[PDB]
UniProtKB/Swiss-Prot annotation:
The modification Phosphoserine is found at S151. Residues 7-42, 48-83 form the EF-hand domain. F-actin cross-linking protein which is thought to anchor actin to a variety of intracellular structures. Association with IGSF8 regulates the immune synapse formation and is required for efficient T-cell activation. Homodimer; antiparallel. Interacts with MYOZ2, TTID and LPP. Interacts with DDN. Interacts with PSD. Interacts with MICALL2. Interacts with DNM2 and CTTN. Interacts with PDLIM1. Interacts with PDLIM2. Interacts with PDLIM4 (via PDZ domain). Interacts with IGSF8. Belongs to the alpha-actinin family. It is found in: Cytoplasm, Cytoskeleton; Cytoplasm, Myofibril, Sarcomere, Z line; Cell membrane; Cell junction. The chain holds residues 743 to 892 of 892 of the full protein. Ca(2+) binds at D20, D22, S24, T26, E31. It comes from Homo sapiens (Human). This is Alpha-actinin-1. It is linked to Bleeding disorder, platelet-type, 15: An autosomal dominant form of macrothrombocytopenia. Affected individuals usually have no or only mild bleeding tendency, such as epistaxis. Laboratory studies show decreased numbers of large platelets and anisocytosis, but the platelets show no in vitro functional abnormalities. The gene is ACTN1.
Length: 153
């Protein structure tokens, strides 16, 4: 949980691919900086953008290679996306860990999003009372078609 959606990695890969027509797999510090703008970042020829870009280049390239890889900008994106989610990635992730069962426990889903994101998930996930049921059993498969946190929406 707390990660990229299918549509998110789509535009991330596409923008790096749009700017990196050489398919080197890496671009320069200015090229990748303008590549963020394509996603909606105010980081381009602005002194504030330069000030935060200075942080970014130090993370993706502490070796001062003078280049940034697709995976390297993702390394910091993973830190900023820590406190946010989308319905796509949260439902998708449960199926990976609960593919062994037909349901999820509150304990198991807390591994995916340990902060209050888990509590916000329990507040919508359908309850489970099947043969393998435990007091914290929730049917994640069911969540896709039914939720109760927004019953009056």
């Amino acid at each position: 949980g707390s990660s990229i959606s299918q549509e998110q990695m789509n535009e991330f890969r596409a923008s790096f691919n749009h700017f990196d027509r050489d398919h080197s797999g890496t671009l320069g510090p200015e090229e990748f900086k303008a590549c963020l703008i394509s996603l909606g970042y105010d980081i381009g020829n602005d002194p504030q953008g330069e000030a935060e870009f200075a942080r970014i280049m130090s993370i993706v390239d502490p070796n001062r290679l003078g280049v940034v890889t697709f995976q390297a900008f993702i390394d910091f994106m993973s830190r900023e996306t820590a406190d946010t989610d989308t319905a796509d990635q949260v439902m998708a992730s449960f199926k990976i860990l609960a593919g062994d069962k037909n349901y999820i426990t509150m304990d198991e889903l807390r591994r995916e999003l340990p902060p209050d994101q888990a509590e916000y998930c329990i507040a919508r996930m359908a309850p489970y009372t099947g043969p393998d049921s435990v007091p914290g059993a929730l049917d994640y498969m069911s969540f896709s078609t039914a939720l109760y946190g927004e019953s009056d929406l």
